[PDB]
Design brief:
homodimer; 212 residues; eleven-stranded mixed beta barrel; 12 strands; metal-binding (chains A, B)
Chain lengths: 212, 212
């Protein structure tokens, strides 16, 4: 079912520290090349009063270059698809949780996303848009209880150097039964290439490769 | 000061779940190639009644292949050296803590190591030597408060497949003032190549490369 050039459509609904918001987005990528890009416009809750960066990792590992010798959990799950659930555990106590349900409408991936975050201090980097980018990461994927877990060490670089540590725990549930892979890694680079003054419109990229 | 072929000597003193023990070791490696190996004999507390694997990551990132474009925190710190301190946070509640003070006696690294672990359940993988190996990892190193932090997602593979998650947090303190590097990664493979029946004698390897 997977095609070399696939499309993306997505709505996210959420709220951070009590501020509700909604974001929709459109994009494209190459599942076999692990690269993807998308435009995202804030449709409600604009202007967002928190660092947009906390959102970007939520905006589909079908977009990761898997090699011949490693089992592709995600590409196997289609056309029915898969969901995932992720805790995001920033070191200043702030906590984000998010789910995405992913279905395939022909040649276009549809993401359904609920997002919610809280307990971010008012002086903190998230509440004062002092975050710059996500450093690159290496996700560690392993099987548990017949689903696939992905934990990863994440860091936001901040204004003035320095870094803001966040701990990711993801669980991926294929809707149908697919073949399960051994412990492996997925390299990530995630970038906001372009964006308008208050992040209403945002151009987001992520490049990703699997290995062992 | 660093030489292409350097030697290693080490004593570890510790105790896990109340069982005291002592281990000494001798070895060699190539600091610029990131590879190293050592023989380790249990000198006290034999036979150990817990998975030896919890120890191996404690048995010197001077042994990591750093490239030209990345600042080598560790190789800079010599001949005076550096210490490090690490929490090790196994998901079944068991907790290991360890420090190593590293000095250079001519052409031979000397490790001074205190080790201590507790709260491992009796039915658990550590207490029933059901651990097999450490999966490979990618350490994420970043500067904080003028020292160097290294956090990494770690997993033990178990008997019957499955994996046993542990969270590493390390702090590295150069004894003298050295130049500090940007956020980067260090790939690790760590293996027990050979060992006798009850791990009194153990041949330990680790291969490691830095990048960005």
């Amino acid at each position: 079912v997977i095609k070399p050039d696939m499309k993306i459509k997505l709505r996210m609904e959420g709220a951070v520290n009590g501020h509700p918001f909604a974001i929709e987005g459109v994009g494209l990528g190459k599942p076999f090349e692990g690269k993807q890009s998308m435009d995202l416009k804030v449709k409600e809750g604009g202007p967002l009063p928190f660092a947009y960066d906390i959102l970007t990792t939520v905006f589909n590992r079908v977009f990761a270059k898997y090699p011949e010798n490693i089992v592709d959990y995600f590409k196997q799950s289609f056309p029915e698809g898969y969901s995932w659930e992720r805790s995001m555990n920033y070191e200043d106590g702030g906590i984000c949780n998010a789910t995405n349900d992913i279905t395939l409408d022909g040649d276009c991936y549809i993401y359904e996303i609920r997002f919610r975050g809280t307990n971010f201090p008012a002086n903190g980097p998230v509440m004062q848009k002092r975050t710059v980018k996500w450093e690159p990461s290496t996700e560690n994927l392993y099987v548990r209880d017949g689903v696939l877990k992905g934990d990863v060490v994440m860091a936001l670089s901040l204004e003035g150097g320095g870094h803001y540590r966040c701990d990711f725990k993801t669980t991926y549930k294929a809707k149908k039964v697919v073949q399960l892979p051994d412990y492996h890694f997925v390299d990530h680079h995630i970038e906001i290439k372009s964006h308008d003054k208050d992040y209403s419109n945002v151009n987001l990229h992520e490049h990703a490769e699997a290995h062992s």
